[PDB]
Symmetry: C3
Subunit: 213 residues, 3 copies
């Protein structure tokens, strides 16, 4: 089974300790892995791009001896109206540009460390602002950001776990939002248990070197 | 190995216990999983769309207490000329809209139940009519219906097993249609074993 | 773990025992699998298309009794400026058409045999010629060839392992090129160890038994 001793978790409120859910996916995994330490770099509301506490800069706070790096972002870039930009952009002003710098930063400074990118579940319309099941204030769909992550991660060889495509649920359906989410955006504790299971499966199927007994 | 005790199988002829192959993929997995019950909701000729016994309506025959739901459709939508439509349709007269009605109904009524969509093998041309290895009567490739499935399932978070891209075979190639199919459309018992194998390892990959 | 007793490896300089790497990915796997034989059909500088020792023709050297077939090509097609063509092409003169020929051939002749295509790691620019981290002599990105492999394999139901996407590395990043490659094109021994792992993982999630 895949486990790590010094994981680092870069993300937004779904990763941040300050959460509406008391038990996060990484708290489940850190316990199962019996980690030496688990570095939480989640900040509520954070985007990958320039708009709010850019992950494309905050990544530089990841510990030098991290043995695993996970990035869990994009839902705020969608919901808080980060311009999407275009494939080939290389500055943090756009979502595409900010992914490029994030991905270059990670591969330059932790060349041998296993990494994955996690993108969020399809959100509902009940949170507020431009957090919609349909389009954000700039008129893009969540799946446009989700596609940007898939395209950009590919160019750097970084595996991409899409909770959007494969989590088994969408918060745009009330019956599932009621069971797995706090507010059609943030997973509750049940949603986090699901995410932990999805992440472990993904790691098992993509990272053989880091199988242990 | 992942297993389920009360699976429900929503599909067409490849699922229905009424024809050319005596042993289906879901028979193989029922035996392997030692199920309590295995609900066969296959109807021959059935489309996901409005044209024939719409699965986008028939999903409602799924038992309240199913603990796994697989949907295996699309091949009739292609071969019996269901209008494809486009992304953003919400009406069952198109394949895109029908997919939306179906996936909506699944997640509403079984929010906690593991489910997956299975896409069919690339077919050959021996069955006739619009069941062609090239294009159907509307000018679409089988792969256009495949992409529709891949796109719609993604919006709903529903894992997608593409036998089309991953089965290791195509019925458009005679050497493989002769081994694994009855007629270049329907898998034979050997084809159903392959399907069962691919499903089982997909499950192992995506479920704990 | 999924293992095979008589695998055949069709590819370029990354597969060929000509190469600058002493222990290739298939050498590692042959040793894990306890093989009866392990057929190395790598030819250095080889393309899938017509230009240099076309795999779309050479695949016929694969042994009749192969119990597994991997095709590991495309990088020379990109880097040596093989015309990409378009979806639906049929000649070996284009990349799309050569892929079609290769796939028809493999599925016709080895219908019951498990098989997969492996796509190359993102290359850097220090090798030379059109082996660029940006675009080839024809204006194409490496990912255009990678997208061709994705589409074509799918039409024949052949699983595709994209090392480009999923390897955890790119040789366009110097920090990773210095560790995992000989020259930003060819993986070194540490690079082949990583490839062996990804291949083994991919085999376990797409195949039973
Ligand atoms: Mg490209
Ligand atoms: Na899926
Ligand atoms: Na090769």
């Amino acid at each position: 089974h895949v486990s790590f001793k010094r994981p680092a978790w870069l993300g937004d409120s779904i990763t941040a300790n300050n959460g509406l859910a008391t038990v996060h996916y990484h708290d489940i995994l850190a316990a199962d892995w019996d980690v030496e330490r688990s570095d939480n770099l989640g900040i509520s509301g954070s985007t990958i791009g320039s708009r709010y506490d850019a992950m494309a800069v905050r990544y530089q706070a990841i510990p030098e001896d991290a043995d695993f790096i996970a990035v869990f972002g994009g839902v705020n870039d969608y919901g808080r109206d980060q311009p999407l930009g275009q494939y080939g952009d290389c500055d943090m002003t756009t979502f595409y540009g900010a992914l490029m710098m994030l991905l270059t930063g990670l591969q330059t400074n932790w060349p041998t460390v296993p990494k994955l990118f996690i993108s969020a579940i399809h959100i509902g319309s009940d949170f507020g602002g431009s957090f919609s099941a349909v389009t954000n204030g700039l008129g893009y769909r969540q799946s446009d950001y989700e596609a940007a992550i898939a395209q950009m991660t590919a160019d750097y060889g970084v595996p991409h776990l899409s909770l959007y495509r494969d989590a088994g649920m969408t918060f745009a359906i009330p019956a599932q939002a009621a069971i797995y989410s706090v507010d059609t955006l943030h997973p509750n504790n049940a949603g986090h248990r699901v995410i932990a299971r999805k992440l472990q499966s993904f790691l098992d199927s993509h990272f053989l070197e880091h199988h242990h007994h």
